[PDB]
């Protein structure tokens, strides 16, 4: 209805938000680090990083952290404003319960925010930002690459038997647990690695056979330039077969090594074919999500308690809540739209969910309080 | 109040914007390159690049450049429209000053845009998009890696003394100026590099000791598969100790090399632990920021001059400005909200800052002109 008192007290809340944001902007960076610790922990250690799209995203993130810190630390102020707004005397034996109201609301919001952070943030960020199936396969592939590297070192030392043994073991382990161009590129890299290892190892005596193997690899590269991947594969197979002649007594062993290389290449291609959705997390989106969660859970823990405390003395009877449930749902949905920075219905519903839950818990608490009062009377 | 003349002249401005955007769309790419030169120059030479998130971001960027070029080159048109809008005769000895008004406003906007570009853009893009502390450390790490590579080449040539000398010097230089898994992976890579260098160098005589070293490395990889990083570190240390036996007279030297490798690995891990915020700049955000800055500074240089020129003849007395200061601040804030594409209060304030500054400079200039006129009279 009227604006005067509402506008004045909204101005009080706004100036409180401004001053507390000014003070909290000093420690914006430590607060941002604390907020980002859960999401970073949920990320893999090898890719524990966040990207920033814009050049002012540091400034935007710091300003958002300051604004949200101000609005969080002004909750006692808005609680006092709300308590003063409704004060018809309230049977002044019951109007003295101001400090209990403000204190209970403040600790309710603080506990909601703390529980949000500690419980929800690590668990949910583990739920979303973790695959646990492609990561295990990637780790298995990295381990297999390490065993292949060890086999190549054994080859470089002139130990064909140990290299073949390791190659067979790795192939068995991989079997127990893709575009043509990509697979051909991987196979070419594997052939180059095997040729380099053989050149380092048996390059003092069998200099005439590695020359033929390298010529066959050159033929493979030529058949890879003009896309004739069948000829490229045939040339790589011939190169490996000739490479097997550097150690005639361990030919099978060398063959096994080549097989492993091919397998690894194939496997890697399969992995890069399977993972068409890589993570690249952003500063502002993650900050917005974390702040939205904390604010939503603070609302969830505060609105029921504030409503119940009003109902103990009586400012909102159950009749008014039942009459205005639909309008309250709508106004909560508009508030969720305002808070959410992204203009999508999905985020609107995700934000409005906590608001509706808080309202429902509040009305349940009010009804329970009224029933207990009636039973006592 | 009425719409007729306002709507007609707004239509004139809109059609002018449309035609100048149509002509300026021809040279959208060179203008975009000129606009992106400062931000690219502020970026490191090794990562002097911009990413585009969407497939139509080229088209969106070109269209935005064309629209903003049209609105920039239509400033004389809107100046003529404004001058014509207020013309009650203006004591027609003073109404003839139309061309001075339009010309002065046009050159004011052009000078504001040029100063914005040349002064602000390089300096501020250097301020934000430059770390200068992690980049120096990264360059030091790259140089240390280069010295380690030179030491490894000296080892590959059979020169253990020179390799040890370089390793000691690099370790001293690094000392003068992290997850367990990542550090173990880096140490494994360093051990592999050292083993490869030793195999290339002393692989003609000490073929029996590098075999034991490679077996110990295999044990390290096994203890790395099942996460037992303590055993992995012990196995790597044993592998390096055995590698030291290839040259018994230079054992310490080889030890030093291994130490350097470990140190480098550790250092690299520390760096990747410290840098949790990598840059990945986008086309549209950077273009929006640059265009916003240029438009804001054009407003800063134009609005005071336009207001002062109106005050010389008199269309806006100081009384009207003092009365409508609050409404003017609000309308400038809504204009800043309209211009800014991102729906955040931070960008709204960042845009509205220049508008308020322009209004304040305009009112100061109007007051100074009035005071000078009163003193003359």
């Amino acid at each position: 209805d009227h604006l005067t008192e509402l506008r004045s007290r909204l101005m009080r809340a706004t100036i409180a938000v401004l001053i507390l944001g000014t003070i909290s902007l000093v420690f914006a960076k430590p607060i941002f680090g604390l907020l980002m610790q859960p999401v970073l922990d949920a990320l893999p250690p090898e890719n524990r990083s966040l990207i920033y799209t814009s050049g002012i995203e540091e400034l935007n993130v710091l300003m958002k952290v300051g604004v949200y810190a101000g609005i969080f630390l002004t909750t006692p102020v808005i609680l006092m404003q709300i308590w003063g707004f409704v004060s018809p005397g309230l049977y002044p034996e019951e109007r003295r319960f101001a400090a209990p109201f403000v204190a209970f609301g403040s600790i309710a919001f603080l506990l909601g925010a703390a529980f949000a952070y500690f419980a929800v943030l690590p668990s949910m960020f583990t739920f979303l930002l973790n695959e646990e199936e492609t990561l295990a396969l990637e780790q298995r592939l990295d381990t297999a690459r390490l065993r292949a590297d060890d086999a190549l070192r054994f080859l470089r030392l002139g130990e064909a038997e140990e290299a073949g043994r390791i190659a067979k073991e790795t192939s068995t382990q991989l079997r127990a647990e893709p575009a043509a161009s990509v697979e051909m590129t991987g196979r070419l890299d594997g052939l180059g690695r095997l040729l380099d290892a053989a050149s380092v190892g048996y390059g003092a005596q069998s200099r005439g056979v590695l020359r033929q193997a390298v010529e066959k690899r050159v033929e493979a590269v030529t058949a890879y330039e003009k896309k004739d991947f069948a000829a490229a594969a045939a040339a790589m197979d011939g190169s490996a077969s000739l490479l097997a002649g550097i150690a005639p007594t361990r030919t099978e062993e060398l063959a096994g090594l080549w097989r492993l290389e091919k397998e690894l290449a194939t496997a890697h291609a399969a992995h890069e074919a399977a993972r068409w959705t890589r993570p690249m997390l952003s500063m502002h989106e993650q900050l917005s999500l974390v702040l939205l969660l904390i604010l939503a859970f603070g609302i969830i823990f505060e609105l029921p308690l504030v409503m119940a405390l009003l109902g103990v003395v009586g400012v909102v009877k159950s009749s008014w809540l039942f009459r205005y449930q639909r309008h309250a749902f709508v106004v909560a949905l508009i508030a969720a739209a305002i808070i959410t920075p992204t203009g999508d219905v999905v985020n609107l519903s995700l934000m409005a969910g906590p608001m509706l839950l808080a309202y429902e818990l509040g009305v349940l608490l009010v009804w329970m309080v009224e029933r207990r009062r009636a039973r006592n009377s | 109040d009425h719409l007729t003349e306002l709507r007609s002249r707004l239509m004139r401005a809109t059609i002018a914007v449309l035609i100048l955007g149509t002509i300026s769309l021809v040279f959208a790419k060179p203008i975009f390159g000129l606009l992106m030169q400062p931000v690219l120059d502020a970026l490191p030479p090794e990562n002097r690049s911009l990413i585009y998130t969407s497939g139509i971001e080229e088209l969106n960027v070109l269209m935005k450049v064309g629209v903003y070029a049209g609105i920039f080159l239509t400033t004389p048109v809107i100046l003529m429209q404004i001058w014509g809008f207020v013309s009650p005769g203006l004591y027609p000895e003073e109404r003839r000053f139309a061309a001075p008004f339009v010309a002065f406003g046009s050159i004011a906007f052009l000078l504001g845009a040029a100063f914005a570009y040349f002064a602000v853009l390089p300096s501020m893009f250097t301020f934000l998009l430059n770390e200068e502390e992690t980049l120096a450390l990264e360059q030091r790490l790259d140089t240390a890696r280069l010295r380690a590579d030179d030491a490894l080449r000296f080892l590959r040539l059979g020169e253990a003394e020179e390799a040890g000398r370089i390793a000691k010097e690099t370790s001293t230089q690094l000392r003068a100026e992290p997850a367990a898994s990542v550090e173990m992976t880096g140490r494994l890579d360093g051990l592999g590099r050292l083993l490869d260098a030793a195999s290339v160098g002393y692989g003609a005589q000490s073929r029996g000791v590098l075999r034991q070293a490679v077996e110990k490395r295999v044990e390290a990889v096994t203890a790395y598969e099942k996460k037992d990083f303590a055993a992995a570190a012990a196995a790597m240390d044993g592998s390096a100790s055995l590698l030291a036996g290839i040259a018994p007279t230079r054992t310490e030297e080889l030890a030093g090399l291994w130490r350097l490798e470990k140190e480098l690995a550790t250092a690299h891990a520390a760096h990747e632990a410290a840098r949790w915020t990598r840059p990945m700049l986008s086309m549209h955000e950077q273009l929006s920021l640059v265009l916003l800055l240029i438009l804001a500074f054009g407003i800063i240089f134009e609005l005071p001059l336009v207001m002062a020129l109106l005050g010389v003849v008199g269309v806006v007395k100081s009384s009207w400005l003092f009365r409508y200061q609050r409404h003017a601040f609000v309308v400038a804030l809504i204009a800043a909200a309209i211009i800014t594409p991102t729906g955040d209060v931070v960008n709204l304030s960042l845009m509205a800052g220049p508008m308020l500054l322009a209004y304040e400079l305009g009112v100061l200039l109007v007051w100074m002109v009035e005071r000078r006129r009163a003193r003359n009279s």
């Binding site: 604006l3 005067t4 506008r7 004045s8 203009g343 | 601040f329 804030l333 209060v345 709204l348």
Partner: peptide
């Protein structure tokens, strides 16, 4: 957006005061 709208509304109600 909604944030810009609520900001302009807050400013409009703020300049006039109670």
């Amino acid at each position: 957006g909604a944030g810009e709208m609520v900001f302009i509304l807050v400013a409009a109600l703020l300049i006039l005061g109670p």
